[PDB]
Design an enzyme around this catalytic site. Structure first.
Site, PDB file in Angstrom:
ATOM      1  N   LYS A  33       0.796  -1.228   0.000  1.00  0.00           N
ATOM      2  CA  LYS A  33       0.000   0.000   0.000  1.00  0.00           C
ATOM      3  C   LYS A  33       0.835   1.289   0.000  1.00  0.00           C
ATOM      4  O   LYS A  33       1.516   1.593   0.967  1.00  0.00           O
ATOM      5  CB  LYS A  33      -0.984   0.002   1.161  1.00  0.00           C
ATOM      6  CG  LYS A  33      -1.860   1.217   1.190  1.00  0.00           C
ATOM      7  CD  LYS A  33      -2.892   1.153   2.273  1.00  0.00           C
ATOM      8  CE  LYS A  33      -3.717   2.431   2.254  1.00  0.00           C
ATOM      9  NZ  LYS A  33      -4.758   2.485   3.320  1.00  0.00           N
ATOM     10  N   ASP A 118     -13.461   2.273  10.105  1.00  0.00           N
ATOM     11  CA  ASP A 118     -13.928   2.282   8.715  1.00  0.00           C
ATOM     12  C   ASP A 118     -14.244   0.902   8.133  1.00  0.00           C
ATOM     13  O   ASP A 118     -13.889   0.596   6.996  1.00  0.00           O
ATOM     14  CB  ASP A 118     -12.958   3.048   7.814  1.00  0.00           C
ATOM     15  CG  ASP A 118     -13.576   3.396   6.469  1.00  0.00           C
ATOM     16  OD1 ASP A 118     -14.821   3.383   6.365  1.00  0.00           O
ATOM     17  OD2 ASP A 118     -12.827   3.727   5.528  1.00  0.00           O
TER      18      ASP A 118
END
Ligand SMILES: c1ccc2[nH]ncc2c1
Length: 278
Positions: A33, A118
């Site tokens: 990432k 989230d």
């Protein structure tokens, strides 16, 4: 990043892009990432929260002043799993095993005071062995969809709790069962008002303190609550009961992960394996 060959784009978050990648030396395949000093310290505490139901952060590369997170790689997420299962739906025994495992993951992080903040089907990753794992855990603190946001976040609570993760996971549980998103808001007020329409406009009776929240308005329409048997059929009573408790308005009443693990719904848990096409 010199140590990796990018094999493909596994996706794009708010934080940045994820790549499937191969360690040029080890040949381990990982998800890489790309992000974009406090954030450094927070991220390095995440390297230590290891659990079978948490996507393992392998490494953190701060170099040339960019930030790369190297994660354990899994082939599928629950979103893709769902779209694939939409014709026949995910069997209940597998839905139930997924929920149980995620609750386990949450109970772990929550006991170490780390929240996800989230949760959504795209960051729930599955394998051929019937495992399900939480991805991107703890990254929100470290630095688009509203559908899984808890009501206390939407009402402008700045100091919200681990309860926000139980809420999201309730919404996901319902979505697995019905094969439709529970509360698919396309703005903040649309999201809040879809919650109200289904669960009733919250008041001081069900949620002491609600009317004093920062974005609460006495002008909110007053909708009546719906029965759960209309919300998630054909889920059985144990399941509705548990889902009810994960969707309590008052964060203090909302069931904890560890208490949800003890609920009668999990009496006959098993661990089926999915049929996944890679
Ligand atoms: C996002 C974050 C971590 C990941 N591991 N495997 C796929 C994936 C996607």
């Amino acid at each position: 990043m010199e140590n990796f060959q990018k094999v493909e784009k596994i996706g794009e978050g708010t934080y940045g892009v994820v790549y499937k990648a191969r360690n040029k030396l080890t040949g381990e395949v990982v998800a890489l990432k790309k992000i974009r000093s406090t954030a450094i310290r927070e991220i390095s505490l995440l390297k230590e929260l290891n659990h079978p139901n948490i996507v393992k952060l392998l490494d953190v590369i701060h170099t040339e002043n960019k930030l790369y997170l190297v994660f354990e790689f899994l082939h599928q997420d629950l979103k893709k799993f769902m779209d694939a299962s939409a014709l026949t739906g995910i069997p209940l025994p597998l839905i139930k095993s997924y929920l149980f495992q995620l609750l386990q993951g949450l109970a772990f992080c929550h006991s170490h005071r780390v929240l996800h903040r989230d949760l959504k089907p795209q960051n729930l990753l599955i394998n051929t062995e019937g495992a399900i794992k939480l991805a991107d855990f703890g990254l929100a603190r470290a630095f688009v969809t509203l559908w899984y946001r808890a009501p206390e976040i939407l009402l402008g609570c700045k100091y919200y709790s681990t309860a926000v993760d139980i809420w999201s996971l309730g919404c996901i549980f319902a979505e697995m069962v019905t094969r439709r998103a529970l509360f698919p808001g396309d703005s903040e007020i649309d999201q809040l008002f879809r919650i109200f329409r289904t669960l009733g406009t919250p008041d001081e009776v069900v949620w002491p303190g609600v009317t004093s929240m920062p974005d609460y308005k006495p002008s909110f329409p007053k909708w009546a609550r719906q029965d759960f048997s209309k919300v998630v059929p054909p889920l059985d009573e144990d399941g509705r009961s548990l889902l009810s408790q994960m969707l309590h308005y008052d964060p203090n009443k909302r069931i904890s992960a560890k208490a949800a693990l003890a609920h009668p719904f999990f009496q006959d848990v098993t661990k089926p394996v999915p049929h996944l096409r890679l």
